[PDB]
Amino acid sequence: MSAEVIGQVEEALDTDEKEMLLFLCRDVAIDVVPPNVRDLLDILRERGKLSVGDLAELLYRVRRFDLLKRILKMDRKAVETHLLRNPHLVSDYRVLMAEIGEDLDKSDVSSLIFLMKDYMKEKSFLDLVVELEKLNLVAPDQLDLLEKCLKNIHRIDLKTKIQKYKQSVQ
Amino acid sequence: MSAEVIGQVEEALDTDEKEMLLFLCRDVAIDVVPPNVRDLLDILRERGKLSVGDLAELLYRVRRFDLLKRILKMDRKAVETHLLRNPHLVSDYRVLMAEIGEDLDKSDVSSLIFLMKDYMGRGKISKEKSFLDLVVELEKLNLVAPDQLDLLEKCLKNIHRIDLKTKIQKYKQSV
Amino acid sequence: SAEVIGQVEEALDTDEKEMLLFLCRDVAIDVVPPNVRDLLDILRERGKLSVGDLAELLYRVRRFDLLKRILKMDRKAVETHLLRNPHLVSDYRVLMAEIGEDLDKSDVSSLIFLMKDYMGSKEKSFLDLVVELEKLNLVAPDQLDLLEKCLKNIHRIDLKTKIQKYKQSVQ
Amino acid sequence: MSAEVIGQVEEALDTDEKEMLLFLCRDVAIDVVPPNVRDLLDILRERGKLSVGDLAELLYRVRRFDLLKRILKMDRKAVETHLLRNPHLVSDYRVLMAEIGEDLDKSDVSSLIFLMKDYMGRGKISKEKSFLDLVVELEKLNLVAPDQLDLLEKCLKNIHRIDLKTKIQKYKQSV
Amino acid sequence: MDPFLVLLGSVSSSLSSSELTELKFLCLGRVGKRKLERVQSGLDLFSMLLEQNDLEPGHTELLRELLASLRRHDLLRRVDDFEA
Amino acid sequence: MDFSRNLYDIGEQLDSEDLASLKFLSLDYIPQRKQEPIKDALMLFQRLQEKRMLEESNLSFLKELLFRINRLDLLITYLNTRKEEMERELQTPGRAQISAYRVMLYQISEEVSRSELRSFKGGLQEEISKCKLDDDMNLLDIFIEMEKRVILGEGKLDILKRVCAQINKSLLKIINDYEEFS
Amino acid sequence: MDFSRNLYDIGEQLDSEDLASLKFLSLDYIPQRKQEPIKDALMLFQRLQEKRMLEESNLSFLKELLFRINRLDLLITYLNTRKEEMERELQTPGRAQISAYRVMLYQISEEVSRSELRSFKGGLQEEISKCKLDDDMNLLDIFIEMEKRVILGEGKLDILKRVCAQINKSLLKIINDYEEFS
Amino acid sequence: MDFSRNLYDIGEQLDSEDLASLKFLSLDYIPQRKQEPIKDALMLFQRLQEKRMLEESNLSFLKELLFRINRLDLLITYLNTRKEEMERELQTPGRAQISAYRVMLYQISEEVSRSELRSFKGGLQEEISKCKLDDDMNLLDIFIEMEKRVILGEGKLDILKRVCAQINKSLLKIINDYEEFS
Amino acid sequence: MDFSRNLYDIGEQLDSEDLASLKFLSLDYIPQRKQEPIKDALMLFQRLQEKRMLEESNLSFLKELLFRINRLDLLITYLNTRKEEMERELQTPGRAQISAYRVMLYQISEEVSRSELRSFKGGLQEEISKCKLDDDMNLLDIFIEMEKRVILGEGKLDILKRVCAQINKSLLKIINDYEEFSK
Amino acid sequence: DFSRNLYDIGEQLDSEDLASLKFLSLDYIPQRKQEPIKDALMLFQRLQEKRMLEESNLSFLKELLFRINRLDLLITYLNTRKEEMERELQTPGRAQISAYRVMLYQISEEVSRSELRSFKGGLQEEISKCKLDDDMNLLDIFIEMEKRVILGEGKLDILKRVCAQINKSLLKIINDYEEF
Ligand SMILES: [Se]
């Protein structure tokens, strides 16, 4: 692990992938609020939470296996075995949030925002999740409102994903 | 209450929440004009106006309930009960101003600035200014006040924002 | 008193402080006050900081909240005082400040690019440019033709008419 | 040359050009760290190392040909012939550093600083560092030198500035 | 891999908008709906599959499958020409 | 005196895209560090005056810049120069200050649409990092990024020809005309 | 009757197409650099206010602009001016602030459909680069580009007539009617 | 009452044609600049919510809009209001928020086919430019343009009668029925 | 089993008329705003997939749709379901996902010719505006407009019978059979 | 100039020839892909996308033009006589159109208008009236029957039943196809 690796990863990511990476690491950097992804990775490395396996997990969550093979020289088997044997840096709740966000187009996100204006710009679903977290409306143990709102926009598949996560927590 | 709490609050807030928090404490920090939020909190603590309940109210006004639960270990009901039992650090006027500002996009704020430029005297500054900055400018010109909201009411009516006019009217009725 | 001067110095903003220094450039003779606190101290020591003088200074920077909180005066009272008593700050400085407030950074940059020929720095305020021109004898209460033409060339005819209105106000 | 010339040069330069001029004369420094450029030029004149040709070379390195013709009454051809026929006041290493610095935007400079912090450290807390400031920091840490450019080569390669790597290679080949 | 990139570019340029929507529907499951909404060309989807390592010059199974589903063997011949 | 006003009027009649074109065509004389803060024409003019390539007695480089960006209206109205006069002056081999390589690159950028630019960016995936392939990058910035990696140059036109063959056929004709001019 | 409120109401009743028409009709008074950031009507008004062409005592240019874009409803509702009045005001010589050459051009843009615009752009292939002929450009932008390349003008209408004859004959009638007013 | 969810379902049961009808029916309250970006029903609701014309306690304007576009199914399913009620509610004077002049116009748009719309456009050639008479324009846009050119209005129905009489008699009957309410 | 490719082939064997029929039969689950941009079968499937009514383990709604549009070839070729099965599956109560009211309407559209459609439009002159009675309107769109005007429904079949009696008698037979089934 | 030759061949074909070619190409172009084909050229392009039409493979185009009895185009634009095509199609392998399809088309060649009325009247119990409208030719009836799985390569019972009630040559064609 070095600065060259962080630079390569930062230069290989796009704006949306950077925004997603910032959201996934919200649970590990709760004190400081890193502005850019480079600062986030630097903070994680300084705090000893950015080993080769941690960066491998981060690249695996954004589904950038080309970077896993080119930069970190790792395949899916290595990252999956590391995640099986070592504790995860990003919780399953954040991965579920990101997955739900990836299965939503801008129209669905707009309709979802319109439903939740009673309880609470082209803002992404992850920004809405951050706003709900700041308002204590969504949490790994508090998904009922998001489930109902996804049901009301006729997105029963995402409701089923949330229910599968809830059953996986048991 | 300690320095760690102030540091956590200052580092956990974003730019918009910081700018809002500075505006909400304008009525209690008159003797100093705090540049950053940390200086504001230090001044409030030194002058004895930053107890645990005061910081809880400040976090509740910026709608940062996650910080209310993580830092101060409080829910919304507890902070509301504290506001019921104790006099408020932030007046309802500042909260109303912030509420009106949150329901205004850049286009609405620009159109509102264009309607008021006759009473301002402000020149050609092109820096996109927030509604709270406009309220600060109006206060500097003695054009808006908790007992002087007619100009803001009329200008919000003229930009077709009748809901904010109703917020102003309900605030006036609560007095 | 000193508490009032301290309150005024702490209550002013950077732009308001710079404007106050520029407006008091003509009354602080032989001295160049760096900060507003030093300027107010000099004015008080020299006997040029009465209640009316501070009221006029606060009125010129359009800081009526300090006029109401500190000096307990409305805009009408200060305007009547300015009507009845001689001014501490001449109308030329007020016109310069008004023109500067009606100029964006791009307009000031283009104006500096036009005037750089008559004065052989970046991010300069309009008041700094006016001070530079005054030190070079390029602008004066009786010498506004060059500034007028330069404002005409940046397609700012409203400021040219402000200058013409000042010229008509002189007689 | 004379004092009026030094005064005109000091008054005509901007902050970035002043910083660059201070960097180019770092090798000639007579056991002193001059803060101001006027002081540096005065020291060079007193030490007999600021003739008309030396100041012409200094103005040529900062690409201020208008000052070269207005103050010293020279064109590019005259100063280029003077540099061809006479030994230089500023070594080719400083000129290479200045050229590399001019071919780097803020993003490339930030990425270069981010790469150097492993070999160097955070250094000055200021986030507005020029390439020349970084070169000075590396020189103080014995990380870059006219005979030690491999680290700079690698760091420029990692920020995809192969043209600057070729500049460094051409300098290495010319010695 | 520039020959592979020119393969992908030629295949993307030889597709219509309807075929692009068909490919978008076919790739749903490997690529999210949000990412598919931003796809404006076959090359975009091919590059998104390149990043996820579901597609590479060594393993062209996904490309051949997607292109055979669209009953377009004219571009399958281009793929086979690249394979040799 | 009037010279500065004329420069200001010329700059006021220039847009941001024309400004980017002017910055690209003057890359061989103004480096990137000094070119980054150039957000108005007057600043470019100031830099040129600092390099004596623009004076009241030297309008050659300004006329060449305004002619190559096809802003003949400003050339005829503010600089008193016609199109034919400029053609004749630029047919002489010595008088051309902007390299034919720059002009050729700029004309390629003039003959590339938005979808063609997207295909260009998709064709340069293995050679340029993704951060520099954002949708806000025009073709000239991509040319600059290629020049940084010594992939584009007066002697290295291979990848340029490859991507142009991947997008359109007239671009190869422009490249071959420049190459045959040598 | 607040002047600022009246201007705001007038601007609220104008869409992006009317805004582009007003920006084109004010090209002779607002340069390209100052026209680029104009994304709403109020901004435009401010520019006019900086040249004293719009104040509570000078509504002539605003009324002329609203009349040339055929927005008589705003003229009668917010400016208290009927259709006939303006006509007489614009029939007196000298008092017309928008040039007859400009108005003519805009009127041509009023008589061109989408397919006719595509035919125009396809007819200007050899004279204008592809980047300035993209599908996201209306006829006024084509007029601006033609003026930049000194192929269109008050004295240079040859290519205009040539391309208009390839599409419609009434456009040639408008061109000749403008020409006779000289 | 999930007021936002109810509004969302009502909007989900509305297509683009009903949206254009609602936007036309709300012209007297939402200006053109604010109507231009309205591309879905929800947005429209927000505008109404900004004027207090749509709230959990004030559904009168929403019910009137849904009744005038003949979407009684949404009125009965999501707003719990049958056809008769609305009628009585709209027969009481003052309570009608949409002007009778507007409604009439929309009803004319209900009784014009495609060939009749083409004949309408051909009959309005001397008063409206070709850009607004293209085949992709609907009758409501023609009404809007006529209102802009002060040829159609609450007091000026002459040209409307002229063009309607040339095609069908029921349109003139609707016009006369609207006129009798005076 | 490439479920997506199989759905793609099924969509490739469907034209625009079958697509309009499927969109009408899916009106009870997909609103008008979501149905408007549906110009191909695939997109339609996507909407169903968003409501958990179409997946690799749930083919009931797809089979019902293909059976109601009389596309038994697709049922036998791509879904491995014969004609008899889909009958028994739909004869068991509860198991029918498409309402009997909807299917009936579609079946009426199966027994109306072009001149009969013109007569239908002429019979609905006083109840529907001319814009919705143009010649480019099929019978299903007329049914949709009637439902919008609360003239057609599960409890309001009066105008339907009135207009059908003026054209043909078998349509009244279908209507009466539907009424006799919903006792 | 292969592209110009294809364009000229397509320009010499009317809408009826286009419908015949689209029916004869049903085994290679699905219904959704056939719907927007409103000219002959657009059909050829589809074949080019399936590698059944190129400058080196004209077999399928020649077979289509021969089965539609357009020998003039074969002689003028493809330089191929009737005997060449006879020999080419008599070999049991190179024939690309299935014998089941051709047979059907040939039945459509031997049915008059009154016979079409009799066919439509004979398919009342299996086909709805909407698909039996007066604008329906025999090929569309074949397509509808295939959709309703009553006609096929293994299900010819209803076809023989309806054909025997009208003419004997139709049953003769069916039996000739079956014996092959
Ligand atoms: Se004072």
Author numbering:
A (entry chain K): 1 to 120, 127 to 176
B (entry chain I), D (entry chain H): 1 to 175
C (entry chain G): 2 to 121, 126 to 176
E (entry chain L): 1 to 84
F (entry chain A), G (entry chain B), H (entry chain C): 1 to 182
I (entry chain D): 1 to 183
J (entry chain E): 2 to 181
Sentences from the paper on this structure:
Fas-associated protein with death domain (FADD), procaspase-8, and cellular FLICE-inhibitory proteins (cFLIP) assemble through death-effector domains (DEDs), directing death receptor signaling towards cell survival or apoptosis. In this work, we present the crystal and cryo-EM structures of ternary FADD-Casp-8-cFLIP DED complexes, unveiling FADD-FADD, FADD-Casp-8, FADD-cFLIP, Casp-8-cFLIP, and cFLIP-cFLIP DED assemblies in a complex. The atomic coordinates depict how FADDDED and Casp-8tDED could assemble a helical 1:5 and 3:3 intermediate complexes, and how these FADD-Casp-8 intermediate complexes are targeted and capped by four cFLIPtDED molecules. The resultant helical Casp-8tDED-cFLIPtDED hetero-double layer appears to locally activate Casp-8.
